[PDB]
Design a protein around this ligand. Structure first.
Ligand SMILES: Nc1ncnc2c1ncn2[C@@H]1O[C@H](COP(=O)(O)OP(=O)(O)OP(=O)(O)O)[C@@H](O)[C@H]1O
Ligand SMILES: Nc1ncnc2c1ncn2[C@@H]1O[C@H](COP(=O)(O)OP(=O)(O)OP(=O)(O)O)C[C@H]1O
Ligand SMILES: C/C1=C/C(=O)O[C@@H]2C[C@@H](CC[C@H](C)/C=C\CC1)O[C@@](O)([C@@H]1CSC(=O)N1)C2
Ligand SMILES: [Mg+2]
Ligand SMILES: [Mg+2]
Ligand SMILES: [Mg+2]
Lengths: 398, 358
């Protein structure tokens, strides 16, 4: 019942804890099935728990690479992307000038619009009663709106909700005090539908079997439509890629810069994931390459992460002879999501998967901020490689 | 404190990286492309296929086009690994039975053209055995262009018992293209050959009992699978799934008079000393891309058992990463600093010439 392999010792989980996740349970189940069908390990960066009902409703599109402004994780704007980034999550309020410029440029360039924020009664009840993100609504008689408050971290900010009827729906419009004056709260909306966008699913990493390693694992830098056209031969492309070859707008929207640093394996797996989620025609949740290839990766914002693994990992001695099952050493929920809570636990999980023949892609930026650089080529070497080397050295007199 | 390089020169794929790593950094096709009215290597040659004539510098595991092989090695060092070859000792791999003139020409290019500080040439199958933590056993190495049986004892290949079978992955893909005509499908071109190679890797398997599997496929559709071509057209594959790799066991399927891989393995063990046969039977290691078929280890276990004496323990070791075992073994070998002895230095080449490799 103990995972022991060279210098790696893992004890069984004592008292498994329930970890709240923002990814809807149905989406976790789909990704558990994608991992099994495709025989890959898929890791997804955190999604705030209050984004759950927004993503589950399938009403909103999500932010890709052209919308670098962060979503908010507090207040009535929780789960949405505020135009004024002082209302966004802490990483954005950290470099306020940079994130406000991202928000503005995404709108001024036509990659997004400035939309009003409307919340229905159900979302208000969720924020007040279930999450306690907003304090109860108090009828402010000096305006007609219903006052509510929220905390960002050390500060309490008021918001005023106005009952409105838009598209025959009864909703609450969010307002705030912009320089001592009541103003409509703005969020980033989809350039085509104009509706507010939610956060996306950011792939942390995809671990593929060693047996399937090939040219499709080469991470490529984005190419312009012209450079890409010259590098491919039209006749060999699928209808999907022929359409991008014949339409510059289609290519820039679904390929090139919009994906970032990506391998061919990941480009295909992104389409499999979005199709399996029923997230096509502008409602995609996965928009770009994984964090393992992200030059701006922030390790602190990568946890808790949800990992989806092939089903043999859950079997008796699924990790190998005498090694046990994945759920013995890592927290696994009802949907089959392995919840990884910190860099050390991610380093342990990666070594377990590498030993079971699943390949890691290491980002050196993952070591930034760590006590010790866990994510290096030498520290992540397969234990079968190290054991065979020990055996050969002993047997050959080397 | 310089890291040695490891380069496995395959007929279909080049695997290259650094000694001390558990996997190659670069895996790309062994092709050189020239415009069809200045040169492209690997991925770029395949990508720009429609406007290039492609050549394979390695035939049956043997380098045959030295000018094109130089382009592959230049691309490996400068474009793939991004290293200066004059600063890195380089381990290269060779097929069993590689002619002496070939490894001398290989040694001449490394020292004169690339100016490597040191070099070593290793037999591919021996490296696979090292990747499994062994120095004794028999390797069946089957790649894209050639298949070999190599019995090894305490680190050394037994040359008299080495078996070569020219049948490998590319012949299996050509055979799959051929037997697909038997259900009305027509794959003929170089691009269509690549679609068939993909069908083969994804849907082919080795039947434990070939005749029973043919009977099952003949009376029901339970063994059928669908495959979507790049253009959306969906085709159905039936008994071709197991008939294609069956050729390894029955080479007469492609017109070859040769014995099957189970027979060459047994005949290879029988050419070795009686006192060592038990060690070969219990350590039969499979390596190379053409040993990746599901069911191949169990079929080899059954076939060897029927040929070997009943008192013999037969064990087939087929690691999940066996397509890269040759590279892994080279990385293990080149990373043991206590092995900086058998490496041919540039000073030694300048004095003795290419014959120093022997
Ligand atoms: N999953 C798979 N199933 C079946 N065949 C496969 C699979 N993966 C690869 N192959 C085949 O294996 C070959 C590539 O393997 P490999 O890299 O071992 O060859 P190589 O070293 O280039 O060739 P050689 O050693 O014969 O010169 C190709 O024929 C390919 O189609
Ligand atoms: N493979 C990649 N190549 C290049 N840049 C990448 C890659 N992956 C991610 N990025 C960079 O990281 C960013 C991904 O994070 P992003 O989704 O914008 O925010 P977040 O931290 O997940 O918070 P929210 O989604 O706003 O809640 C987008 C891009 O600037
Ligand atoms: C994905 C991949 C596989 C492979 O094994 O590729 C190697 C190298 C390749 C070279 C030509 C091809 C168009 C280029 C790249 C494909 C590389 O030829 C192969 O596919 C040949 C021809 S069909 C076959 O089974 N082997 C093997
Ligand atoms: Mg995100
Ligand atoms: Mg993102
Ligand atoms: Mg080979």
């Amino acid at each position: 019942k103990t995972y022991q392999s060279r210098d790696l010792v893992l004890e069984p989980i004592q008292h498994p804890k329930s970890i709240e996740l923002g990814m809807p349970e149905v989406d976790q189940s789909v990704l558990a099935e994608v991992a099994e069908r495709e025989n890959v390990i898929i890791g997804v960066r955190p999604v705030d728990e209050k984004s759950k009902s927004l993503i589950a409703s399938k009403m909103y599109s999500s932010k890709g690479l052209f919308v670098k402004a962060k979503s908010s994780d507090w207040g009535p704007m929780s789960g949405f992307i505020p135009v004024d980034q002082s209302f966004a999550k802490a990483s954005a309020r950290r470099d306020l000038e940079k994130f406000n410029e991202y928000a503005e440029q995404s709108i001024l360039s036509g990659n997004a619009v400035s939309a009003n924020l409307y919340l229905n009664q159900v979302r208000i009840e969720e924020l007040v009663s279930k999450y306690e993100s907003l304090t109860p609504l108090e009828l402010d008689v000096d305006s007609g709106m219903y006052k509510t408050t929220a905390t960002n971290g050390d500060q309490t900010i008021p918001f005023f909700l106005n009952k409105v009827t838009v598209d025959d729906k009864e909703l609450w419009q969010v307002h705030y005090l912009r320089e001592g004056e009541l103003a409509p709260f703005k969020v980033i909306g989809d350039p085509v539908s104009k509706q507010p966008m939610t956060a996306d699913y950011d792939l942390l990493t995809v671990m593929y079997t060693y047996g399937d390693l090939g040219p499709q694992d080469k991470v490529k830098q984005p190419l312009t439509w012209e450079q890409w056209k010259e590098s491919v031969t039209y006749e060999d492309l699928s209808p999907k890629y022929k359409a991008r070859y014949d339409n510059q707008a289609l290519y820039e929207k679904q390929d090139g810069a919009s994906l970032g640093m990506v391998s061919d394996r990941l480009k295909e797996l992104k389409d499999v994931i979005n199709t399996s989620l029923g997230r096509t025609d502008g409602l995609e949740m996965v928009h770009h390459g994984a964090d393992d290839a992200n030059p701006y990766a922030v390790m602190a914002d990568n946890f808790p992460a949800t990992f989806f693994v092939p089903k043999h990992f859950f079997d008796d001695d699924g990790l190998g002879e005498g090694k046990g099952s994945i759920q013995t050493y890592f927290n696994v929920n009802e949907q089959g999501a392995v919840v990884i809570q910190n860099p050390q636990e991610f380093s342990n999980f990666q070594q377990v998967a590498i030993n079971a023949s699943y390949r890691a892609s290491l980002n050196d930026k993952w070591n930034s901020g760590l006590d010790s650089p866990l994510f290096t080529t030498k520290r992540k070497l397969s234990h079968d490689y190290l054991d065979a080397r020990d055996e050969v050295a002993k047997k050959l007199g080397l | 404190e310089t890291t040695a390089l490891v380069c496995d020169n395959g007929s279909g794929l080049v695997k290259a990286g650094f000694a001390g790593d558990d996997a190659p950094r670069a895996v790309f096709p062994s092709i050189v492309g020239r415009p069809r009215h200045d040169s492209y290597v690997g991925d770029e040659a395949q990508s720009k296929r429609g406007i290039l004539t492609l050549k394979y510098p390695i035939e049956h595991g043997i380098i045959t086009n030295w000018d094109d092989m130089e382009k592959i090695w230049h691309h490996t060092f400068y474009n793939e690994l991004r290293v200066a070859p004059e600063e890195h000792p380089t381990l290269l791999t060779e097929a069993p039975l590689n002619p002496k003139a070939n490894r001398e020409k290989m040694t001449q290019i490394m020292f004169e053209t690339f100016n490597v500080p040191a070099m070593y040439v290793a037999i591919q199958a021996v490296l696979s055995l090292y990747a499994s933590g062994r120095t004794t056993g028999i390797v069946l190495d089957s790649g894209d262009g050639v298949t070999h049986n190599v019995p090894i004892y305490e680190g050394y290949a037994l040359p008299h018992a080495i078996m070569r079978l020219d049948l490998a992955g590319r012949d299996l893909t050509d055979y799959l293209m051929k037997i697909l005509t038997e259900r009305g499908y027509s794959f003929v071109t170089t691009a269509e050959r690549e679609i068939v190679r993909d069908i083969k890797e994804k849907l082919c398997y080795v039947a434990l009992d070939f005749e029973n599997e043919m009977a099952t496929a003949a009376s029901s559709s339970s063994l059928e699978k669908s495959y979507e071509l790049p253009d959306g057209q969906v085709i159905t594959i039936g008994n071709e799934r197991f008939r294609c790799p069956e050729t390894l066991f029955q080479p007469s399927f492609i017109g070859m008079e040769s014995a099957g891989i189970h027979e060459t393995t047994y005949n290879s063990i029988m050419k070795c000393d009686i006192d060592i046969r038990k060690d070969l039977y219990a350590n039969n290691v499979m390596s190379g891309g053409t040993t990746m078929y599901p069911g191949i280890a169990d079929r080899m276990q059954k076939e060897i058992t029927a040929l070997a004496p009943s008192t013999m323990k037969i064990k087939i070791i087929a690691p999940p990463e066996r397509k890269y075992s040759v590279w892994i073994g080279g990385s293990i070998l080149a990373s043991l600093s206590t092995f900086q002895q058998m490496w041919i230095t540039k000073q030694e080449y300048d004095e003795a010439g290419p014959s120093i490799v022997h």
